[PDB]
Design goal:
This is part of a larger assembly, with six copies of chain A. Chain A has 149 residues and is α+β, with helices and mostly antiparallel strands. The first copy, chain A, has one helix and six strands. The first copy, chain A, is 27% helix and 28% strand. In chain A, strand 1 and strand 2 form a beta hairpin. Bound molecules: a molecule of 3 linked components (NAG-NAG-BMA), a molecule of 2 linked components (NAG-NAG) and 2-acetamido-2-deoxy-beta-D-glucopyranose (8 copies). It is classed as viral protein/htdrolase.
Chain lengths: 149, 99, 217, 99, 99, 50
């Protein structure tokens, strides 16, 4: 009668030890994550969005803590955002062009090329897009004029 | 579903409450053909029997003994059994039977 | 063989002496009939969980019972089977449109008008949303903000005392636990980060002394 | 044969070929990553004892370990304390021997 | 004799609970991965290769799903690739230059 | 008296199996990390530091 409850409590303690080991594994994973975040935010300016804090990273500062590392992330969040109609690719007499270092942004009548972090209307040129086959495989076809002064 | 979710307001979706196992309806019992019957008709329907002092001891083995034909027969006056039940004769195995 | 399943005709051929067979998972799959000498497959019966298709309690109380992986021929409004099983309490409208409540494995359910109906999902191509001219938010102005983030690195060394945990202020409990072995040492070594060795019994012996007294003559 | 393992740096100047793309094709990829988990509960009575009465009667004396298992599965940590709820008591219901 | 099998099945159930807890931890890790992928692909154009799908990321679209998030990744894969001979650095009258 | 030590060693073996499963999960995580590192370093020039 005593050994029955002994075995029950041994099973409970085994479950507790399993939970503690899983917590230790998660803590080691979080330590690796903190180490790589330190390496990518303090020793360099990472271009990843919402990685060194919340927004576009500019500079980070490390702070010591008991069983942890505190990071002082200095960033800028988007104050005012505007929705724009985008397209996967354009078509100017065949040779469908897809945007590089940015996406196609249209305000209603004209299409421009700009990065997704700031709004800068730029004319579509050959140095801003790359040709990809023809306007058949690429789903989504819009007709525009690719200027090149 | 209200017992499973422990709430009086069930949201819109699918919820698994219990299981369903098809229980066995019938019960079939298969066995090979009943062949090589024991020669009970040779000792029971023998033409010439022996006396009580020189009774024969016929050995019965390696055969299926159908005791239902012996019990379900009003021709026998006494059908007493000692240490075994007459009904459970067809549900027991033995090594050798002497007649 | 004392099992439970549905017996059906098979297309395989056993050897003239092999009675029954089994699959790769070491489970009885087929067996030869002892009288007809024919092979009969053995399939486990319908095992599935029931499901209640409810369009929320705020709209109405009319619900439908959904069975998974079973056929309505063996199950004790409108009765009709589907790809995911049998659905009791709905309709069999042959129409097809967007999925509303995924009941699982294809067919979906929805509420239409005063009754629950069913419809087959086509799921043609998800690529149609590519040219759907979705709106993308492009920032215009920014504001400098600071964010404090804390990520745990190390863990405080947690030890386990099995004596006080399994036995709370008890003597006979500890006396009986002392015979279970040194498992607490292995648990502590595992919690500290040391792997447990897998070997034979080189430290624990199942010995006995047989201290039973002699019976009086 | 004995390996020297001088320096793996010799492969740096091995003028390895690097693939530089020339043309591209627009393609879409659908990726699904699980986020939440369906709440899975454990019923120790039906799992350890399959349609058995004495099994459940003997399991009821093992304690409330099933509650701790369910709390661990739900995401609640198991507390590490002494025996403030389970007692190793006994009643000694043994009958008296006849004189 | 009953408690022996009871303890065996309790060990089996403990193994099952351990597997379920490890699965829950992996699901939480996958949820964190899906969250950071959302943050790096939908709210921004990530320059990482084979991260927002398979290829160079251009735009992503989120889709709801039961216990998961579906991502619609629009990218371009290299159609034709050419191998070229590369070098770690050059040397033009000292002062080795790296690209 | 034998079953007591049997249950103790069964608990020890369960702890060992738990450790092995956690090690397998960590190895799968490291495999995913190696795969994404391959994809981001060999098939492209990553701008991430360290
Ligand atoms: C075990 O007994 C079964 C009894 O059904 C045997 O199956 C049947 O065996 C017979 C004889 O080989 C097959 O031929 C049939 O014989 C009967 C009686 O002579 C005749 O009226 C039929 O027209 C037919 O010719 C019969 O096809 C077969 N199956 C059935 C359903 O009757 C089985 O062979 C026996 N096995 C052994 C090992 O003795
Ligand atoms: C001895 O012979 C008699 C006579 O044939 C057998 O009795 C027959 O048993 C069969 C079995 O069903 C019946 O269909 C007949 O009607 C019986 N006939 C008579 C006249 O009773 C008896 O079974 C034989 N003994 C043994 C041991 O087989
Ligand atoms: C842009 O679209 C999102 C998507 O729902 C919406 O929440 C937001 O209000 C929209 N912004 C504007 C300015 O229309
Ligand atoms: C969109 O941008 C073009 C280019 O500057 C401008 O001429 C036009 O007025 C803008 N608005 C609309 C509605 O086209
Ligand atoms: C492939 O690239 C070559 C490189 O000049 C180019 O001439 C050709 O038109 C391209 N073909 C396609 C289908 O993009
Ligand atoms: C673009 O021009 C081609 C060539 O005439 C034509 O087939 C296609 O319909 C045009 N697309 C649009 C959106 O005007
Ligand atoms: C379901 O099982 C029954 C068994 O009687 C069968 O008649 C029916 O065809 C089965 N339905 C499907 C879809 O397999
Ligand atoms: C695409 O543009 C049409 C026209 O205004 C609009 O109705 C539709 O909602 C847009 N698709 C989106 C925003 O995904
Ligand atoms: C380096 O160039 C030589 C000369 O063709 C070639 O044999 C060797 O395979 C190259 N090394 C590589 C491709 O790693
Ligand atoms: C480039 O090298 C890889 C490495 O094995 C090879 O698979 C591929 O065929 C090569 N491509 C060309 C165009 O030689």
């Amino acid at each position: 009668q005593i050994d029955r409850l002994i075995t029950g409590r041994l099973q409970s303690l085994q479950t507790y030890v399993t939970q503690q080991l899983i917590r230790a594994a998660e803590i080691r994973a979080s330590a690796n994550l903190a180490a790589t975040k330190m390496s990518e935010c303090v020793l360099g300016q990472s271009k990843r969005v919402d990685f060194c804090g919340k927004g576009y990273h500019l500079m980070s500062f490390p702070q010591s803590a008991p069983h942890g590392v505190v990071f002082l992330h200095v960033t800028y969040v988007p104050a005012q955002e505007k929705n724009f109609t985008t397209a996967p690719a354009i078509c100017h007499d065949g040779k469908a062009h897809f945007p590089r270092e940015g996406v196609f942004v249209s305000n209603g009548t004209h299409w421009f090329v700009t990065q997704r972090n700031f709004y800068e209307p730029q004319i579509i040129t050959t140095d801003n897009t790359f040709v990809s086959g023809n306007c058949d495989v690429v789903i989504g076809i819009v007709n525009n004029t690719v200027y090149d002064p | 579903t209200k017992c499973t979710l422990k709430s009086f307001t069930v949201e819109k979706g699918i919820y698994q409450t219990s299981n369903f196992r098809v229980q066995p309806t019938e019960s079939i019992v298969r066995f090979p053909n009943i062949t090589n019957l024991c020669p009970f008709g040779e000792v029971f329907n023998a033409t010439r029997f022996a006396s009580v002092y020189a009774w024969n001891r016929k050995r019965i083995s390696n055969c299926v003994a159908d005791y239902s034909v012996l019990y379900n027969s009003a021709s026998f006056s006494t059908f007493k059994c000692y240490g075994v039940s007459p009904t459970k004769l067809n549900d027991l195995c033995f090594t050798n039977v002497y007649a | 063989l004392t099992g439970t399943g549905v017996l059906t005709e098979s297309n395989k051929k056993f050897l003239p002496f092999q009675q029954f067979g089994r699959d790769i998972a070491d489970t009885t799959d087929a067996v030869r009939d002892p009288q007809t000498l024919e092979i009969l497959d053995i399939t486990p019966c319908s095992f599935g969980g029931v499901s209640v298709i409810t369009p929320g309690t705020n709209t109405s109380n009319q619900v439908a019972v959904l069975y998974q992986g079973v056929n309505c021929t063996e199950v004790p409004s409108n009765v009709f089977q589907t790809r995911a099983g049998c659905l009791i309490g709905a309709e069999h409208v042959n129409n097809s449109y967007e999925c509303d409540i995924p009941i699982g494995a294809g067919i979906c359910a929805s509420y239409q008008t005063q009754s629950i109906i069913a419809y087959t999902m086509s799921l043609g191509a998800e690529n149609s949303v590519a040219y759907s001219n979705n709106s993308i938010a492009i920032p215009t102005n920014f504001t400098i903000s600071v964010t404090t983030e804390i990520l745990p690195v190390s863990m405080t060394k947690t030890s386990v005392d099995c004596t006080m945990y399994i036995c709370g202020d008890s003597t006979e409990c500890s006396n009986l636990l002392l015979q279970y072995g040194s498992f607490c040492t292995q648990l502590n070594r595992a919690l500290t980060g040391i792997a447990v060795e897998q070997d034979k019994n080189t430290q624990e012996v199942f010995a006995q002394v047989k201290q039973i007294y002699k019976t009086p003559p």
